[PDB]
Amino acid sequence: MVKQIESKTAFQEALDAAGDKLVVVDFSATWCGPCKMIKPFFHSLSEKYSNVIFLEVDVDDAQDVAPKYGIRGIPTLLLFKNGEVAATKVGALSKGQLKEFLDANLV
């Protein structure tokens, strides 16, 4: 049921558990307002997908992962597939754009 990654090693570890499942993650911060707007809808989807893994990465704690992905801004939406990023979205988005984007990548 989603797992908060507070380290650069945890991100890799959580991905290993993802296997062939689609991993949609978000880069946020304690001072990120729009980021909190996706929290409610992001978590709900994870229960409505029963296939993909939704995790939470905070750049405040995961300051080592971002630099490795070259992320610059929040709320960033990252899509991982087989340990590799198969989609990169920046800024917040509605529930339909997130789901549509996911359904479009989840296969």
Curated annotation (Swiss-Prot):
Q: Which UniProt keywords apply?
A: Acetylation, Activator, Allergen, Cytoplasm, Disulfide bond, Electron transport, Nucleus, Redox-active center, S-nitrosylation, Secreted, Transcription, Transcription regulation, Transport, Ubl conjugation
Some GO term, biological process aspect, for this entry: which one? response to nitric oxide
Record PTM text: In case of infection, ubiquitinated by S.typhimurium protein slrP, leading to its degradation.
Spell out the residues of the site Contributes to redox potential value.
33-34
Instruction: Give the annotated active site.
Output: 32, 35
Induction trigger: Up-regulated by ionizing radiation.
Annotated site, Deprotonates C-terminal active site Cys, chain positions: 26
Q: Which residues carry this modification: N6-succinyllysine?
A: 8
Instruction: Kindly list the GO molecular function terms attached to this UniProt entry.
Output: protein homodimerization activity; protein-disulfide reductase [NAD(P)H] activity; protein-disulfide reductase activity; RNA binding; thioredoxin-disulfide reductase (NADPH) activity
Transmembrane ranges, per UniProt, are none
Q: Where is the Thioredoxin domain?
A: 2-66
Q: What is its main location?
A: nucleus
Q: Where in the cell is it found?
A: Nucleus; Cytoplasm; Secreted
- Summarize the protein's role: Participates in various redox reactions through the reversible oxidation of its active center dithiol to a disulfide and catalyzes dithiol-disulfide exchange reactions. Plays a role in the reversible S-nitrosylation of cysteine residues in target proteins, and thereby contributes to the response to intracellular nitric oxide. Nitrosylates the active site Cys of CASP3 in response to nitric oxide (NO), and thereby inhibits caspase-3 activity. ADF augments the expression of the interleukin-2 receptor TAC (IL2R/P55).
Q: How does it assemble?
A: Homodimer; disulfide-linked. Interacts with TXNIP through the redox-active site. Interacts with MAP3K5 and CASP3. In case of infection, interacts with S.typhimurium protein slrP. Interacts with APEX1; the interaction stimulates the FOS/JUN AP-1 DNA-binding activity in a redox-dependent manner.
> Which protein family is it in?
Belongs to the thioredoxin family.
Q: What is this protein called?
A: Thioredoxin
Organism, by scientific name, is Homo sapiens
Q: Which residues of the full protein are shown?
A: 1 to 66 of 105
